[PDB]
Amino acid sequence: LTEEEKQQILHSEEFLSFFDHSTRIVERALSEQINIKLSLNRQFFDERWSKHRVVSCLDWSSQYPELLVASYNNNEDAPHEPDGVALVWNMKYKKTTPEYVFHCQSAVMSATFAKFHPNLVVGGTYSGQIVLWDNRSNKRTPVQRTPLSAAAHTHPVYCVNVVGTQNAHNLISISTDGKICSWSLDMLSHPQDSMELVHKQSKAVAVTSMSFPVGDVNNFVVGSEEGSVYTACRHGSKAGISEMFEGHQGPITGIHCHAAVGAVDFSHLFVTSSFDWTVKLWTTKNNKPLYSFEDNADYVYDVMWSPTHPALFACVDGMGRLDLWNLNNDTEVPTASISVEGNPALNRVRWTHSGREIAVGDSEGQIVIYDVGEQIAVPRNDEWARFGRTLAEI
């Protein structure tokens, strides 16, 4: 009768593949196969990693369009417990439990998947230290960490992304100070590129969020907490701010370029969600906003296009309501709307890849995903033509 060999083999941690397959399979075992317009689909609220915790960012994995990453700042509930909380959440089979967890010693501000590698997850923190994490390996610590140096990011980083293809990739990050930095996925300890974005008279731009024209690398677009939107080329013949936009009165919070691609070219359309309920749509060739979204006041955070429909997008209000806003059918009234129960301060919204459903973050951490009407999800050539003519409206 063994008494220590079992105890020591339990103490010895060779359970990596053990725990991996056990977790990936037991939630599968949760299935009950016993032989004897908007609509909520799946409400996810982790009790252990999201009690009174604010959603910081959201992302859907293009490589695996069932895998989501969500962030969190430090938890005011308990400082001693881990502060930077990162959750990887799944859509294989229903389960209250998150599929993966991740911790960072610093509060996590933004996160995303890597396009170069379909398993790595990269996230910017509050200390301005980019954090790498390996999904397949079972660990809590960051796998890699960019140095905290004058050359590297030092102010809190709020947007990070991967550009290029899977053999021409490049990880671009923005610090709110105005630093752009380009890293590689194979090494996360030295900036391959880095420069301090400057608009004029050498003053920097307090960048809050950034996006890029779909299907294109370089020639980036950034939003500033000063309330001004800029277009700045990454390398070109000259890096730095290329164009300053008349912009919105308050801070520009959620910026996104158009993404749907079809019979027409609309990759120059920008949606910006400022701090005045104002979801502004414009085009890069015109300095003035093309339209204004106004139904209330006070802070719609983020706006995001639907990758499949060309004239349809989402924007979530801090008042606690998500309205799906269409352009081809309407210009003043949301074609769809819903409110998360409890009326919570909904922070972030993310269209899932291929669309057909949406993900929403919350101040409480209860992220909710749910689909859209079929009659509203799917576009058609009519949608593109009428969208072109509605742009021609003014």
């Binding site: 063994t2 079992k6 037991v26 075992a29």
Partner: protein
């Protein structure tokens, strides 16, 4: 980790009892009592060795990585890879 593993594997359904078995049968761990755990897990280990032989019969390269039996009164779980033999006592439903 140990305690977190069992805790999470258990509260997912309010499982009646599971103990971690990293050895070939005869586990000294317990969840509701020593006998009903140890002897039953040893019987499971003996049975799954035969089941592994069975799956190797049709082709020796085959190995069993997942096993469940859901009967009128119980649902038994084990996912062997090299020595990791699961036990789950749970309602049939």
């Amino acid at each position: 980790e140990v305690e977190e593993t069992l805790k999470r594997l258990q509260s997912q359904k309010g499982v009646q009892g599971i103990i971690v078995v990293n050895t070939e049968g005869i586990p000294i761990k317990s969840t509701m009592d020593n006998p009903t755990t140890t002897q039953y897990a040893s019987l499971m280990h003996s049975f799954i060795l035969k089941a592994r032989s069975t799956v190797r019969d049709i082709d020796p390269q085959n190995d069993l990585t997942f096993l469940r039996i859901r009967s009128k009164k119980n649902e038994i779980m084990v996912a062997p890879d090299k020595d990791y033999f699961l036990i789950v006592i749970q309602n049939p439903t």
